[PDB]
């Protein structure tokens, strides 16, 4: 893999938390990056006050998660599936209904695209190497088709080469030859090595406040966290209206601003508190 | 082009005893669906099944016509009417047909699921529908494989007189920009371009037949000029990943529907289901 010192310029748009929309040139660049590379890094999107509260909440929840009889893991030890809280006090419009995120996902997936994931990944100290996989499959084997989903990844601490910054395979989102994927979405080793010779994977630091938007079919893997601190990620995924997903459980205390919006969420509104763990 | 019988190029002649197609027969069926987007399977269903479904839908028509607004497909005389979901009228050879699912499994995958149990009552003196598709392409201006197959069951002999559907062979793969309006109607300029290359067909279809077609196939309902309503039972198989609301079924059929490797997107209800309105309480 190529280990970089910063998000590569070819994949990155630098914003501030004041930016509510991309100008036409910036949106065209964002869409060109997603089309060609399948991964877009947006730095400086979220105020530290939001990421601070989400980081704290997820670190506070981790003991209760680790105390379970069976700790749900992504492929290998140390990659813990952990939903962030869906308390009203930790559900932020600038996270769930981000105007720049939806400007991009509306342009790629259509005005009826909807968020259908509000989840997270806690990468623990001493975690193992995941196999290279896609989070969402191609819809038919051996066929080239456009995107139907965009993962929206929100690091809740600075991601470094040490603490488990994800490995990404740029341009891998369009690859769908026969016999490429097993039943868990892991890439066959022969296809990995063919691809590596043409377009090797990258790992790079991602500062907290960043949002990563990627094609749900992009090849990637979680990697070892060699630091002494858990590395929390908040994960959302926008889908075309026609892709079948179970709804996100949200408290009805956010129904007023979630259900109103032209930034669609596939949501089931629950009376009282939701048990996110 | 008005024909005297289902054309041989679209047709496999079966009997009700045919449970699975031999590999050569299945290859022919799949070649027809791939090229033409419509496959006619004659002689699939026993008269005993079609007789009871026809009777049940004709018996229900008064309750349908009594509604404040009678749901119509585009134009007068094409009435949307769901067949009953009483246990006594839910037949495994209709809902879970082994030849149908052999074909839909081969096209859509082993996880393909029926998500429609509906119907069309074409009344005497009905109007001409616009040419449309029942299910859209998933992205505009893009060629992609099928994600859905309509499974149409005529409940009387369909004739050129009584409103046998017009089908546009090979139209299931067409998806140029600005081809379709918000109702899935084909824009007139695209209709006429297509007609010059591959004009539509209409043909009689004997009761007992099952029509399998790409959900994106261009077609239209046409006038019923007979003295009798022309009932059709409609199902649609989708890829596992296509979002559809479930079919409401009584839990009295859960044992044989939910067991099956012939998947149904079903919600099982404790009482009887109101098939006409869907006004059951949960
Ligand atoms: Ni992953
Ligand atoms: Ni139609």
From Swiss-Prot, chain B:
Q: Does the keyword Repressor apply?
A: no
Respond yes or no to whether keyword Transmembrane helix is given for this record. Answer: no
- SUPFAM superfamilies, A to Z: Clavaminate synthase-like
Biological source species: Streptomyces kanamyceticus
Annotated keywords: Antibiotic biosynthesis, Iron, Oxidoreductase
List the protein's name. Answer: Kanamycin B dioxygenase
* Recorded catalytic activity of this chain's protein: kanamycin B + 2-oxoglutarate + O2 = 2'-dehydrokanamycin A + succinate + NH4(+) + CO2
Enzyme's top EC category:
oxidoreductase
The organism's superkingdom is given as: Bacteria
> Main role?
Mediates the conversion of kanamycin B into 2'-dehydrokanamycin A during the transformation of kanamycin B to kanamycin A.
